[PDB]
Amino acid sequence: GIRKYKPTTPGRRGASVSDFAEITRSTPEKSLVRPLHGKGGRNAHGRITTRHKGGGHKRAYRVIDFRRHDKDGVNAKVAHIEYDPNRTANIALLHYLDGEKRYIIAPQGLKQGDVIESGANADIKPGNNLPLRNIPAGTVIHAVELRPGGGAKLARSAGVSIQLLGKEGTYAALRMPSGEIRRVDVRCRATVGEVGNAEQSNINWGKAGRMRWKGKRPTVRGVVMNPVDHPHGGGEGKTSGGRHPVSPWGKPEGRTRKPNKPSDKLIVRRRRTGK
Amino acid sequence: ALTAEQKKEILGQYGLHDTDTGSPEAQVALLTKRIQDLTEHLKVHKHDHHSRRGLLLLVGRRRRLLKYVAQVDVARYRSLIERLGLRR
Amino acid sequence: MRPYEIMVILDPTLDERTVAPSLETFLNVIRKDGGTVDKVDIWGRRRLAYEIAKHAEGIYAVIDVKAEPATVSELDRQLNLNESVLRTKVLRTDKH
RNA sequence: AUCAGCUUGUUGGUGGGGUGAUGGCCUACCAAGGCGACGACGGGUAGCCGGCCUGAGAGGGUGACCGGCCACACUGGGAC
RNA sequence: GGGAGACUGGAAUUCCUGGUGUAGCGGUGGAAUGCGCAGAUAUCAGGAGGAACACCGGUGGCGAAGGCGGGUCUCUGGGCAGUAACUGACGCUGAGGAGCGAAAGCGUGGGGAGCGAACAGGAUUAGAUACCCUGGUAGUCCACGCCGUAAACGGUGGGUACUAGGUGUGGGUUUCCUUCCUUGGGAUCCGUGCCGUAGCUAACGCAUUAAGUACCCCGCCUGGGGAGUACGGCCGCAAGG
RNA sequence: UCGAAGGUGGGAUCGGCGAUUGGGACGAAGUCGUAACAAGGUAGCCGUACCGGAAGGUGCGGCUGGAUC
RNA sequence: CGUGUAUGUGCGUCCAUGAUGAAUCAGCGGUACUAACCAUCCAAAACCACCGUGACCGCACCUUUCGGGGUGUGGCGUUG
RNA sequence: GGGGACCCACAUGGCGUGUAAGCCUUUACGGCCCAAGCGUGAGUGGGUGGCACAAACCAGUGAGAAGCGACUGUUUACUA
Ligand SMILES: [Mg+2]
Ligand SMILES: [Mg+2]
Ligand SMILES: [Mg+2]
Ligand SMILES: [Mg+2]
Ligand SMILES: [Mg+2]
Ligand SMILES: [Mg+2]
Ligand SMILES: [Mg+2]
Ligand SMILES: [Mg+2]
Ligand SMILES: [Mg+2]
Ligand SMILES: [Mg+2]
Ligand SMILES: [Mg+2]
Ligand SMILES: [Mg+2]
Ligand SMILES: [Mg+2]
Ligand SMILES: [Mg+2]
Ligand SMILES: [Mg+2]
Ligand SMILES: [Mg+2]
Ligand SMILES: [Mg+2]
Ligand SMILES: [Mg+2]
Ligand SMILES: [Mg+2]
Ligand SMILES: [Mg+2]
Ligand SMILES: [Mg+2]
Ligand SMILES: [Mg+2]
Ligand SMILES: [Mg+2]
Ligand SMILES: [Mg+2]
Ligand SMILES: [Mg+2]
Ligand SMILES: [Mg+2]
Ligand SMILES: [Mg+2]
Ligand SMILES: [Mg+2]
Ligand SMILES: [Mg+2]
Ligand SMILES: [Mg+2]
Ligand SMILES: [Mg+2]
Ligand SMILES: [Mg+2]
Ligand SMILES: [Mg+2]
Ligand SMILES: [Mg+2]
Ligand SMILES: [Mg+2]
Ligand SMILES: [Mg+2]
Ligand SMILES: [Mg+2]
Ligand SMILES: [Mg+2]
Ligand SMILES: [Mg+2]
Ligand SMILES: [Mg+2]
Ligand SMILES: [Mg+2]
Ligand SMILES: [Mg+2]
Ligand SMILES: [Mg+2]
Ligand SMILES: [Mg+2]
Ligand SMILES: [Mg+2]
Ligand SMILES: [Mg+2]
Ligand SMILES: [Mg+2]
Ligand SMILES: [Mg+2]
Ligand SMILES: [Mg+2]
Ligand SMILES: [Mg+2]
Ligand SMILES: [Mg+2]
Ligand SMILES: [Mg+2]
Ligand SMILES: [Mg+2]
Ligand SMILES: [Mg+2]
Ligand SMILES: [Mg+2]
Ligand SMILES: [Mg+2]
Ligand SMILES: [Mg+2]
Ligand SMILES: [Mg+2]
Ligand SMILES: [Mg+2]
Ligand SMILES: [Mg+2]
Ligand SMILES: [Mg+2]
Ligand SMILES: [Mg+2]
Ligand SMILES: [Mg+2]
Ligand SMILES: [Mg+2]
Ligand SMILES: [Mg+2]
Ligand SMILES: [Mg+2]
Ligand SMILES: [Mg+2]
Ligand SMILES: [Mg+2]
Ligand SMILES: [Mg+2]
Ligand SMILES: [Mg+2]
Ligand SMILES: [Mg+2]
Ligand SMILES: [Mg+2]
Ligand SMILES: [Mg+2]
Ligand SMILES: [Mg+2]
Ligand SMILES: [Mg+2]
Ligand SMILES: [Mg+2]
Ligand SMILES: [Mg+2]
Ligand SMILES: [Mg+2]
Ligand SMILES: [Mg+2]
Ligand SMILES: [Mg+2]
Ligand SMILES: [Mg+2]
Ligand SMILES: [Mg+2]
Known part of the structure; x- marks a missing residue:
C-alpha cells in the first residue's frame, strides 16, 4: 500500500513511497535483458532535443510482450510479479506451456497463481488479451491496440484505462481517460481489467x-x-x-x-x- | 452462524457427557468457534460496526463465563485454557 | 445444498427448439460439480411491458435448482456474459 | 488533579559500627524494586485536645481564659 | 428498512447529436437582468453521465443510540414463543479508561446530473451588504483518515418486583362453536399507538411502555450576568473540542 | 568526612507594574436600524460553515416549546 | 597459450548387436439422421355467456317556441 | 558542574586468545573445554609530587530577540 517515512532528516521529512509488497523476485531474468543506456535527453546528433531531462541513473531494458499475438491456445501461470522501473506499472513474468517466457503488463490485483489465456477462448479474468469479437461491451480494458495485429500502443495508464462502450458495424467505440470517445476497429487487440x-x-x-x-x-x-x-x-x-x-x-x-x-x-x- | 452438523459435533466432542449441552465447556466452545469464524469474516469486511457490537458482547459474555470457571475450579479452568491454547 | 429459483429471458431471435439444448449445456456445469437435481419448464412469446435492449418480446424459462452458492454464482457469471440473454435473477426457495 | 506518577540509603537481606534500648541510626557487600486512583508525590492554610457559641438532634463555626501536651527563644547551625 | 460488499432495473433532470417546426421562451404581487432570430421554446429518435428510489409507506418494523427502506446474491448480529435437557450465585449498575456516533468542516486522490453557502447583476424600500428573480464557486457523491459536538427530546439512566381497564397494530404458540372457510370465540408472551382510575405533581400533565409505591448503582444542579469565557492541562494538521 | 553562611547557572510557583489592545457591567439620552414575542408580516429554535457596521441572512441535518387546512 | 613426432590405451564407416519409432486395407464416438409414444405451458381457422358501444335503425324524458344536443333500453355490427 | 598524573593493594581478579593434557566421533587440514603462556581495559580504597594532572600538539565561544529564505544544494573561473 502506502507507507510514510518518518522525518529522520530535514530533507526526507515529506518523502512517502508506495511500498512494493507486490514483489516476488529481485534479480531480473538475464536472458531477456537488452543493452540500453540513458540517452541524456540528446539525440545521436549531439544537440539537446528536450531540456529539463537527462542524466541520472543508467538502467537496463527488457522486451515486453505488448502485442501478444504469436502464440494462442496455451495457458500460462503467473511466474513472478517483479518490478520494472522503466514503467509506472509492474511486469509479471509468465511460464507458458511451450516454455517461452515473455514479460507482460501486470494488471490490477494480479497475484501469483492465476492461469492466463491469450486468444479467442480466453475468459474475462484480467491479463487475457483477445480481439473485440470476444469481449462484452462495457468492460474495462487496457493495453489496447489500433489494428488487427500491428502491435498495441494505448491504454496502459496505472489506475485508469480505456473503457469499451459499444460495437456498431465494423468499428468499435472506446472511452478515453480524459472522457473522450475514439472509433477503432472491431478486430483490434485489447486486454481485460485495469492496470x-x-x-x-x-x-x-x-x-x-x-x-x-x-x-x-x-x-x-x-x-x-x-x-x-x-x-x-x-x-x-x-x-x-x-x-x-x-x-x-x-x-x-x-x-x-x-x-x-x-x-x-x-x-x-x-x-x-x-x- | 454455526449450524446443526458442526454444532452438535462440537457440543458432543467437548461435552462432559453425551447429553449435556449447557455446560460451561460447551458454551465456551461455541463462543470461541463463533468468534474465530466471524473474526475471519470481519478480516475481509471492515466497517461492520453492528457486527463488531456482537463481537464485543460475545467477548464480554465469554469473559464472564471464563471468570466463573476460574472461580469455581482452578483445575478445570487451566485444563480448558490449555486445551484451547488461549492466553486468558 | 439449498433450493434456488432461477428465471432466464432469451432474445426472441432464437427459435424455441434451441432453448432446451442451450439451457442444459449451461447447467451441465452444476450437474457435474455438486450432483444436483433440477426441474425445467418453458413458456415463451409474451408481450413485454416495455422495450428492453430495443426488443419487444421474449421467451421465459424457469428452473428450480438445488445446488451450491458457488455453482449458482458460476452459472450467473457464465450466463449473463452471453449476448443472447436479456435479464436473469436467482432467489431462495426456502424461508430466506 | 487547573498537583499522576514519586523515590536511589530508595526499598529488602547479610556482616560490621552506633546508641540507655531494637532499628539504613551510619558503613560495606548482594537483589530490584517499595509507595501509587480504597487519592502517592506536589500546591495553600493552620499548633492539637478537654472545652466555647449556635442548633431539639444531626451538624456547623471556633480554640477567648483555665488546664493536658507540642514547638521556639533576634536569624541559621554545632557541641560540652 | 439490522449491517457490509458486489451485480442489476425503471422514471425524471441536464447535456450532446439528427429531423420537424416557427418568433418568442423562462420568470414574479408587476417587470428587468437570462437564452433566441447564428434558429430558442416545443416535439420525436438515439446516446452519455451523476444523484436518489415516487406508489407499498402508516403515528407500522428493526437497531443500544445516531439512524435505517428499487430488486438479486454472498456472510453475519440482535430479539421472540413453546420442550423446559444441562451449568448450578455466573446477576445488576459501573468512577477513572476504552469503542461507536446527525449534519457541517479539514487532508490526499477521483467523481460531480440536480440542488446549493459565498459572489455578480436585475427588483423593492428614504435605505437592503436580506426576504424575490437570473447565474453559479466550495460542499452535496466515492475511498482512506480525521473533529466529536445537536431542542443527540420521551427535554425523563439502566435493571428488577407489585398496583384497576377500555380501544387498534405486529410476531408466535394453543384450544373450542367448528363450516373446521371466519379480525369466529378463548388462553398465553413480546413490541408498539390513544383515552382513562386510585396515586403523584405548583400547574400543564404522567398514569403497567408511570413523573405510582420501592430496591441497587452512576452522572448532573445549588439566584441571574460575568462565562461555557481567560489562564493552565489533554486531543486534534487546523477550524476547533 | 560532615557541616551553617556566601557565590556561581539554569528550571517552577506566587506575584507587583507595564505602552497599547481584547472583552464585560453599570450609566441615560441620542443616531443607525426591525431582530424576537400573534402565521411579528421570511415559523421559531439547535448543531455547524460562509457572508455582512449592526441586530442578522443563507446552506445542510434535527425538534415542535408552531397557527391555519 | 599454440605446431609435430609415434608408441600405448583405445575405436567404424566399408561386418553388424543393440534402443525403438513411424507411413498402408478393415468401424464402432446409448450419444442419438428419421414416421411416434408418455407428461407439462401457451395459442391460429370464434362455439357458448356477460359487458363496453366507430357508425346505423329507433321507443320515453329534459332542453331554445320548435331546432342542435344530453339521459335509459332494444336489433345487430365489433372503432376495439 | 564534577573526576582525569604516578605508585601500591584488592588482583595468581574479570575479559580475549589459546598449548600440553582431557572428553568425543561420520578418524580428520575434525567439535567441546583449556592448567600453563601471551595480551588486556574498568573501578574502589590508601599514599605521593607540582601553582597547574584532557598539562604538549590537536581540539565547538555561548545565550536572548527580530527580517528574508522551508532545509542539503548551484552560480557572476579573475571585485558580488
Ligand atoms: Mg518535504
Ligand atoms: Mg535492453
Ligand atoms: Mg550538422
Ligand atoms: Mg547563448
Ligand atoms: Mg496566452
Ligand atoms: Mg527576444
Ligand atoms: Mg521540464
Ligand atoms: Mg520555471
Ligand atoms: Mg553521468
Ligand atoms: Mg514502478
Ligand atoms: Mg480527451
Ligand atoms: Mg441468524
Ligand atoms: Mg546491621
Ligand atoms: Mg540483633
Ligand atoms: Mg535504621
Ligand atoms: Mg551495612
Ligand atoms: Mg469534643
Ligand atoms: Mg439542630
Ligand atoms: Mg444543623
Ligand atoms: Mg479545634
Ligand atoms: Mg495548666
Ligand atoms: Mg504524653
Ligand atoms: Mg532558634
Ligand atoms: Mg531554632
Ligand atoms: Mg463497505
Ligand atoms: Mg436534436
Ligand atoms: Mg429535446
Ligand atoms: Mg457529471
Ligand atoms: Mg435434572
Ligand atoms: Mg445483562
Ligand atoms: Mg457493570
Ligand atoms: Mg460493571
Ligand atoms: Mg470512573
Ligand atoms: Mg465514567
Ligand atoms: Mg478508537
Ligand atoms: Mg478510534
Ligand atoms: Mg449532508
Ligand atoms: Mg458527512
Ligand atoms: Mg474549510
Ligand atoms: Mg477529505
Ligand atoms: Mg479532492
Ligand atoms: Mg444553482
Ligand atoms: Mg439561494
Ligand atoms: Mg462575470
Ligand atoms: Mg446580491
Ligand atoms: Mg451537550
Ligand atoms: Mg435521534
Ligand atoms: Mg440515557
Ligand atoms: Mg429502574
Ligand atoms: Mg402486555
Ligand atoms: Mg384519586
Ligand atoms: Mg393535588
Ligand atoms: Mg391514565
Ligand atoms: Mg414503568
Ligand atoms: Mg420525580
Ligand atoms: Mg452579554
Ligand atoms: Mg455558565
Ligand atoms: Mg491553557
Ligand atoms: Mg499575572
Ligand atoms: Mg500595568
Ligand atoms: Mg431609535
Ligand atoms: Mg420581526
Ligand atoms: Mg420583515
Ligand atoms: Mg421569525
Ligand atoms: Mg426567526
Ligand atoms: Mg448556529
Ligand atoms: Mg446567504
Ligand atoms: Mg434542518
Ligand atoms: Mg410554546
Ligand atoms: Mg581447540
Ligand atoms: Mg576422548
Ligand atoms: Mg558430535
Ligand atoms: Mg598540586
Ligand atoms: Mg517593481
Ligand atoms: Mg548550505
Ligand atoms: Mg544552492
Ligand atoms: Mg536567471
Ligand atoms: Mg560558474
Ligand atoms: Mg529580470
Ligand atoms: Mg567574482
Ligand atoms: Mg571565481
Ligand atoms: Mg566574489
Whole structure:
C-alpha cells in the first residue's frame, strides 16, 4: 500500500513511497535483458532535443510482450510479479506451456497463481488479451491496440484505462481517460481489467536526488531567465514578463493538434477539461 | 452462524457427557468457534460496526463465563485454557 | 445444498427448439460439480411491458435448482456474459 | 488533579559500627524494586485536645481564659 | 428498512447529436437582468453521465443510540414463543479508561446530473451588504483518515418486583362453536399507538411502555450576568473540542 | 568526612507594574436600524460553515416549546 | 597459450548387436439422421355467456317556441 | 558542574586468545573445554609530587530577540 517515512532528516521529512509488497523476485531474468543506456535527453546528433531531462541513473531494458499475438491456445501461470522501473506499472513474468517466457503488463490485483489465456477462448479474468469479437461491451480494458495485429500502443495508464462502450458495424467505440470517445476497429487487440499500481499516484517525491535519478533536470523559470534567452527574461525585481506566457521556443499557449490525421476521422470530439 | 452438523459435533466432542449441552465447556466452545469464524469474516469486511457490537458482547459474555470457571475450579479452568491454547 | 429459483429471458431471435439444448449445456456445469437435481419448464412469446435492449418480446424459462452458492454464482457469471440473454435473477426457495 | 506518577540509603537481606534500648541510626557487600486512583508525590492554610457559641438532634463555626501536651527563644547551625 | 460488499432495473433532470417546426421562451404581487432570430421554446429518435428510489409507506418494523427502506446474491448480529435437557450465585449498575456516533468542516486522490453557502447583476424600500428573480464557486457523491459536538427530546439512566381497564397494530404458540372457510370465540408472551382510575405533581400533565409505591448503582444542579469565557492541562494538521 | 553562611547557572510557583489592545457591567439620552414575542408580516429554535457596521441572512441535518387546512 | 613426432590405451564407416519409432486395407464416438409414444405451458381457422358501444335503425324524458344536443333500453355490427 | 598524573593493594581478579593434557566421533587440514603462556581495559580504597594532572600538539565561544529564505544544494573561473 502506502507507507510514510518518518522525518529522520530535514530533507526526507515529506518523502512517502508506495511500498512494493507486490514483489516476488529481485534479480531480473538475464536472458531477456537488452543493452540500453540513458540517452541524456540528446539525440545521436549531439544537440539537446528536450531540456529539463537527462542524466541520472543508467538502467537496463527488457522486451515486453505488448502485442501478444504469436502464440494462442496455451495457458500460462503467473511466474513472478517483479518490478520494472522503466514503467509506472509492474511486469509479471509468465511460464507458458511451450516454455517461452515473455514479460507482460501486470494488471490490477494480479497475484501469483492465476492461469492466463491469450486468444479467442480466453475468459474475462484480467491479463487475457483477445480481439473485440470476444469481449462484452462495457468492460474495462487496457493495453489496447489500433489494428488487427500491428502491435498495441494505448491504454496502459496505472489506475485508469480505456473503457469499451459499444460495437456498431465494423468499428468499435472506446472511452478515453480524459472522457473522450475514439472509433477503432472491431478486430483490434485489447486486454481485460485495469492496470495495477493505482496507489502510485499517492507517491510523494521527496527531494532532488530521487529526481535526477528518475531523469528530469531542474526547471529554470523564465521570469529570472535572461531576456535574450527567453521572452520572459529581464527585469529588475520579480516581473511576469509583461505579456502572456509563451514557450521560449516561439509559440504561446493554444491549439497544437494538427488535424487531418488518418484517425482524425476516427475521433468524434476532443477532450474537455475541468467539467 | 454455526449450524446443526458442526454444532452438535462440537457440543458432543467437548461435552462432559453425551447429553449435556449447557455446560460451561460447551458454551465456551461455541463462543470461541463463533468468534474465530466471524473474526475471519470481519478480516475481509471492515466497517461492520453492528457486527463488531456482537463481537464485543460475545467477548464480554465469554469473559464472564471464563471468570466463573476460574472461580469455581482452578483445575478445570487451566485444563480448558490449555486445551484451547488461549492466553486468558 | 439449498433450493434456488432461477428465471432466464432469451432474445426472441432464437427459435424455441434451441432453448432446451442451450439451457442444459449451461447447467451441465452444476450437474457435474455438486450432483444436483433440477426441474425445467418453458413458456415463451409474451408481450413485454416495455422495450428492453430495443426488443419487444421474449421467451421465459424457469428452473428450480438445488445446488451450491458457488455453482449458482458460476452459472450467473457464465450466463449473463452471453449476448443472447436479456435479464436473469436467482432467489431462495426456502424461508430466506 | 487547573498537583499522576514519586523515590536511589530508595526499598529488602547479610556482616560490621552506633546508641540507655531494637532499628539504613551510619558503613560495606548482594537483589530490584517499595509507595501509587480504597487519592502517592506536589500546591495553600493552620499548633492539637478537654472545652466555647449556635442548633431539639444531626451538624456547623471556633480554640477567648483555665488546664493536658507540642514547638521556639533576634536569624541559621554545632557541641560540652 | 439490522449491517457490509458486489451485480442489476425503471422514471425524471441536464447535456450532446439528427429531423420537424416557427418568433418568442423562462420568470414574479408587476417587470428587468437570462437564452433566441447564428434558429430558442416545443416535439420525436438515439446516446452519455451523476444523484436518489415516487406508489407499498402508516403515528407500522428493526437497531443500544445516531439512524435505517428499487430488486438479486454472498456472510453475519440482535430479539421472540413453546420442550423446559444441562451449568448450578455466573446477576445488576459501573468512577477513572476504552469503542461507536446527525449534519457541517479539514487532508490526499477521483467523481460531480440536480440542488446549493459565498459572489455578480436585475427588483423593492428614504435605505437592503436580506426576504424575490437570473447565474453559479466550495460542499452535496466515492475511498482512506480525521473533529466529536445537536431542542443527540420521551427535554425523563439502566435493571428488577407489585398496583384497576377500555380501544387498534405486529410476531408466535394453543384450544373450542367448528363450516373446521371466519379480525369466529378463548388462553398465553413480546413490541408498539390513544383515552382513562386510585396515586403523584405548583400547574400543564404522567398514569403497567408511570413523573405510582420501592430496591441497587452512576452522572448532573445549588439566584441571574460575568462565562461555557481567560489562564493552565489533554486531543486534534487546523477550524476547533 | 560532615557541616551553617556566601557565590556561581539554569528550571517552577506566587506575584507587583507595564505602552497599547481584547472583552464585560453599570450609566441615560441620542443616531443607525426591525431582530424576537400573534402565521411579528421570511415559523421559531439547535448543531455547524460562509457572508455582512449592526441586530442578522443563507446552506445542510434535527425538534415542535408552531397557527391555519 | 599454440605446431609435430609415434608408441600405448583405445575405436567404424566399408561386418553388424543393440534402443525403438513411424507411413498402408478393415468401424464402432446409448450419444442419438428419421414416421411416434408418455407428461407439462401457451395459442391460429370464434362455439357458448356477460359487458363496453366507430357508425346505423329507433321507443320515453329534459332542453331554445320548435331546432342542435344530453339521459335509459332494444336489433345487430365489433372503432376495439 | 564534577573526576582525569604516578605508585601500591584488592588482583595468581574479570575479559580475549589459546598449548600440553582431557572428553568425543561420520578418524580428520575434525567439535567441546583449556592448567600453563601471551595480551588486556574498568573501578574502589590508601599514599605521593607540582601553582597547574584532557598539562604538549590537536581540539565547538555561548545565550536572548527580530527580517528574508522551508532545509542539503548551484552560480557572476579573475571585485558580488
Ligand atoms: Mg518535504
Ligand atoms: Mg535492453
Ligand atoms: Mg550538422
Ligand atoms: Mg521540464
Ligand atoms: Mg553521468
Ligand atoms: Mg514502478
Ligand atoms: Mg520555471
Ligand atoms: Mg536567471
Ligand atoms: Mg527576444
Ligand atoms: Mg547563448
Ligand atoms: Mg529580470
Ligand atoms: Mg517593481
Ligand atoms: Mg496566452
Ligand atoms: Mg480527451
Ligand atoms: Mg441468524
Ligand atoms: Mg546491621
Ligand atoms: Mg540483633
Ligand atoms: Mg535504621
Ligand atoms: Mg551495612
Ligand atoms: Mg469534643
Ligand atoms: Mg439542630
Ligand atoms: Mg444543623
Ligand atoms: Mg479545634
Ligand atoms: Mg495548666
Ligand atoms: Mg504524653
Ligand atoms: Mg532558634
Ligand atoms: Mg531554632
Ligand atoms: Mg463497505
Ligand atoms: Mg436534436
Ligand atoms: Mg429535446
Ligand atoms: Mg457529471
Ligand atoms: Mg435434572
Ligand atoms: Mg445483562
Ligand atoms: Mg457493570
Ligand atoms: Mg460493571
Ligand atoms: Mg470512573
Ligand atoms: Mg465514567
Ligand atoms: Mg478508537
Ligand atoms: Mg478510534
Ligand atoms: Mg449532508
Ligand atoms: Mg458527512
Ligand atoms: Mg474549510
Ligand atoms: Mg477529505
Ligand atoms: Mg479532492
Ligand atoms: Mg444553482
Ligand atoms: Mg439561494
Ligand atoms: Mg462575470
Ligand atoms: Mg446580491
Ligand atoms: Mg451537550
Ligand atoms: Mg435521534
Ligand atoms: Mg440515557
Ligand atoms: Mg429502574
Ligand atoms: Mg402486555
Ligand atoms: Mg384519586
Ligand atoms: Mg393535588
Ligand atoms: Mg391514565
Ligand atoms: Mg414503568
Ligand atoms: Mg420525580
Ligand atoms: Mg452579554
Ligand atoms: Mg455558565
Ligand atoms: Mg491553557
Ligand atoms: Mg499575572
Ligand atoms: Mg500595568
Ligand atoms: Mg431609535
Ligand atoms: Mg420581526
Ligand atoms: Mg420583515
Ligand atoms: Mg421569525
Ligand atoms: Mg426567526
Ligand atoms: Mg448556529
Ligand atoms: Mg446567504
Ligand atoms: Mg434542518
Ligand atoms: Mg410554546
Ligand atoms: Mg581447540
Ligand atoms: Mg576422548
Ligand atoms: Mg558430535
Ligand atoms: Mg598540586
Ligand atoms: Mg548550505
Ligand atoms: Mg544552492
Ligand atoms: Mg560558474
Ligand atoms: Mg567574482
Ligand atoms: Mg571565481
Ligand atoms: Mg566574489
